[PDB]
Amino acid sequence: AHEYHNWLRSPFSRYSATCPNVLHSVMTLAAMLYKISPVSLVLQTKAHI
Amino acid sequence: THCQENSETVALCTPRIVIGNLPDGLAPGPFHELRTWEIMEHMRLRPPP
Structure with a gap:
């Protein structure tokens, strides 16, 4: 039950509870795993995402 | 409502x-x-299955 130390927390389960069972929901679950590292900020920002 | 009883009103x-009991007007x-x-x-069922 150690939520605070898990990787995937409450927003993920709340999202997958309601989301329609289609391809884009899978893709956006994948996009929800983009990291919060500063190097990831450089890489995402240079991609203009 | 008003009702009748044994020799009484x-x-x-x-x-x-439930909310459905409100008059249709x-x-x-x-x-x-x-x-x-x-x-x-x-609930994200906008186009239902």
């Missing part, structure tokens, strides 16, 4: 347990259908 009050059928569409959009 009495007043009766009871609760409207005060909450009509099209309104209930639209409110249902609202709840369905809330």
Whole structure:
């Protein structure tokens, strides 16, 4: 039950509870795993995402 | 409402347990259908299966 130390927390389960069972929901679950590292900020920002 | 009893006329009050019990002039059928569409959009069932 150690939520605070898990990787995937409450927003993920709340999202997958309601989301329609289609391809884009899978893709956006994948996009929800983009990291919060500063190097990831450089890489995402240079991609203009 | 007013009601009859054994040699008596009495007043009766009871609760409207569900919202559907409101008179249709005060909450009509099209309104209930639209409110249902609202709840369905809330649960992401906007186009239902």
